[PDB]
Structures are given as C-alpha cells and as structure tokens.
Amino acid sequence: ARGPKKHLKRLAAPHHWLLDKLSGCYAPRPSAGPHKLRESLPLIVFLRNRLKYALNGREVKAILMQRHVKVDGKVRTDTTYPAGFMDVITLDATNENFRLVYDVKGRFAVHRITDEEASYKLGKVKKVQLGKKGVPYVVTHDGRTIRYPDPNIKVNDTVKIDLASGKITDFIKFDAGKLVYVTGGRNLGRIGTIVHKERHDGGFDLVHIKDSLDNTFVTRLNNVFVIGEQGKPYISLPKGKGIKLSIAEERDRRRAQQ
C-alpha cells in the first residue's frame, strides 16, 4: 500500500465485536483515538449491535449528531470513535452510564453503573517522564497525559482519574496481593490476585495470578491492570466477577436456571 488504509473487512475485524459474517462485506474501521484498533469498540457497534438502540448506521449517525452520547464526560460525534477498556459512556436522555469492561468470555460487556461511579475512571500508568520546563507527567493506557503526578506513582501503577477535571484522585501501586484484571491473552477478562512477579531483564515480565477459586495462571505484565486490593475493587465488576468457569458446569447452571 502507498499509504494508510481506510477500509476493514468483516472477516478481518476483531472477533470480540461479534459481527455477522454475511450482513455485509465491510466492518466499521475505528478511527484514530485513545485506544488501539484491535482493543477498541467503535460506538456504532455499541449502539447498534449491543444496545440495539439503532437499527442501522444512519440512525447511529442521527443519534450522535443529536449530541446525546458522551464518552468520558465529553460529547463525541464520530461513528467510529474508538471507545475502549474502562471507558465511560453516558446517555442522558435514557439516563444510563456504562463502563466498558470485558466479560469472562473475553468480550466487552454492557455493564450499567451509577452516576457516582461514572464520575471517575481508572488508568494504567504506561509512562512517567519529565516534560518541557521540568514538569513531570504521566501517560496512561488511554493516551491521557496528566501533569504534576504524585512522585510515588510509577509505571504499572493505577491512577483514579476524575473525568470532570482530569486529575488523579488516588492511586494503587503494583505489588503482590493486589487485585488485577486481565486485558489480553486467552485469560482475557479474568480477575485475580497477584502472587509473584517474575522479572526478566531485556524481556517480557511474567505475573502469576490466583483467582478466588484457587486456580493459578501466568500472564505477561502488559495484559495486567491493577483494579484494587483483594475484595475491595474500586469499580463495580460485571456479573461473574471475572471468574473463569468450565464447560460442564456451564451446561449445569444453564440447566439449573432454565
């Protein structure tokens, strides 16, 4: 190609969006934004294929141009705006606030939250560095740069960002015993507690995570997101609480509730 691509085939789209393979030939290409293309949910999919509020792309555009959707407290009018992990989506006219959190299956789940919970979000500290004029700043996972961070904040820590003012309220250090959320790999969407962090200089660090059921799994550090201390998450969790459950029991409880 002689330049950046602008089209996305449905088969090539991220699997977790759950798009019909025969509905059309192309899928919404997320525009540039806070989150990466493969780890983002465009607003069109959320409003049409998840909430079912709109029946087609044009109706989604009509909703957006009416300025009823807010992302992180800001109005967005792009159909393919890349909303992502820990993103707050507010619909005032319908009066709901949603937090984009993966389910156990590995898919963004429609999780409704209260207003007081919608007032803040969490961000994994991807980078800390001194800017121009000797002003420290922190870059989070969603591309937010916050100046004058607390000196104790380091990489791999989590910062509680208030949406209205965009300032850090609290933070969590990355240490053993902390509650973590998996954001990648086939363990995507699971929740557990840190046990040990294995370090390899010049390589990818590995973290051992133990679930509430005592099952243990190892994951690369890049896919780990600290969300609080054990038993005290700073955000409301989706149904299932990030516990992976086998297939036989899946049959079992589906029958039981049925």
């Binding site: 002003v135 420290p136 100046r147 004058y148 607390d150 000196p151």
Partner: protein
C-alpha cells in the same frame, strides 16, 4: 495579420485587420515589451506608441515571454505561468508555444497603447468601459474615496441598483477587515484565556513544589532517625 490594440486607460480595445505588408514588416523582428511607432503602422496611428504584449500564430499557439526564438518550441509549463492551467496540484505539462520574436506567421498580434497620438481612434480613445466592481476592503474604499480615518467607510460603500420586473432594490459588497465589536470581543477573550492559563499553570507548579518539599523533609527526617 490582425492587430488587437488595447487602450488600458479607457479599458477599451478593438481589432484592426491588416493587408499591406509595410506595417507588418516594421512589426517584424521586434520582441514582447518593445515599443514601436504607430506612424509606421499607418496614418491613422500617426503619433501613437504600441507596446507588444503577445500574439497567436496561424495554428493558434500563443506567444510566451522569456523564450527568444522566432519558431515554436515545446516548453514544460508548471503552476503560475502563462499558456497553461494545471488541472491537478503539482501537474506539469509540456506544450508547444510560439517564441517571443515577432514573425510573418503570427495570425494576431496584441498591442497596448502606451501613448496617444494626435488623431483619435473611433473604437478605442473615443469610448470608455466602466470598471465592473468597486473596492471591497475598508482600506481600499478609503483609498478610492480618499477618506479620513475618522470618516466611516460604511456610508461610502458603492451600491448597484437591480430591477427584476417591476421590483427594484440595491446591492452592496461586504467589507472585510472592518472594525466591529465582535472582533474586539474575540481579541479580548483570547487575551483573557492566555492570562488565565498562565495563572493556572503557576498555581499548579506552586502546589507541586509544596508537595515535593514536604516529601523531601519527611524523608530527610527518616534518614536522620536511621542514623
């Protein structure tokens, strides 16, 4: 060859068909921008001065300034040049153009009246064509009317009357770069924004400095305790 003579003071212009070769030959060997005496052209042009500006040949190709030849040549023309209008940005096209040396094979030659002779041409000197449009920017209006700074351009706008059937009205241009309260408000808002930003940054820097000093003091106290 045909002569397209333009009197720019009046804005007028007209064509003269030529048959005798004496005037045509005194036109020979000249160059675009050079001046020739009208009397050599004919008695009707006695006392006139003609500046050569260009022309077209028997095949229609135009004359181009800067190329000093009596014959056509294929020149690679680009943006912002005569004889070529680029269709696409950065487009360059090589086109055959006639040289700037006057010759027998010029179908029409364009001339500009530098100076008027004793006799008046019927179609050029005796007629005038008004300017199509008047000044638009405020300073151009002031310059055209010689207004003072205190005088407002708003009252001196040229207005043209238009009749549609029995209905009639007037139309006037929109002046640009006019001093209006909106521009003042925008300037003031911009200044206030920048000042407020600077103050906010100073406050944040001061608070960070206090936090750093407190942390520094307590860690020094702990080091003292360890000793």
């Amino acid at each position: 060859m045909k002569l397209n003579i333009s009197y720019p003071v009046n804005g007028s212009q007209k064509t003269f068909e030529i048959d005798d070769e004496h005037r045509i030959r005194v036109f020979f060997d000249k160059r675009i921008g050079q001046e020739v005496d009208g009397e050599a052209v004919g008695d009707e042009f006695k006392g006139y001065v003609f500046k050569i500006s260009g022309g077209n040949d028997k095949q229609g190709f135009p004359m181009k300034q800067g190329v000093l030849l009596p014959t056509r040549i294929k020149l690679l023309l680009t943006k912002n040049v005569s004889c070529y209008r680029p269709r696409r940005d950065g487009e360059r096209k090589r086109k055959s153009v006639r040289g700037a040396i006057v010759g027998p094979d010029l179908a029409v030659l364009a001339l500009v009246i530098v100076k008027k002779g004793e006799q008046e041409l019927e179609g050029l000197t005796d007629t005038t064509v008004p300017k199509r449009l008047g000044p638009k920017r405020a300073n151009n209006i002031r310059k055209f009317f010689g207004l003072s700074k205190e005088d407002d351009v708003r009252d001196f706008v040229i207005r043209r009357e238009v009749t549609k059937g029995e209905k009639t009205y007037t139309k006037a241009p929109k002046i640009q770069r006019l001093v209006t309260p909106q521009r003042l408000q925008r300037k003031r808002h911009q200044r206030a924004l920048k000042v407020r930003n600077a103050q906010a940054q100073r406050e944040a820097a001061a608070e960070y400095a206090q936090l750093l000093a407190k942390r520094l003091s307590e860690r020094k106290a702990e080091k003292a305790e360890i000793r």
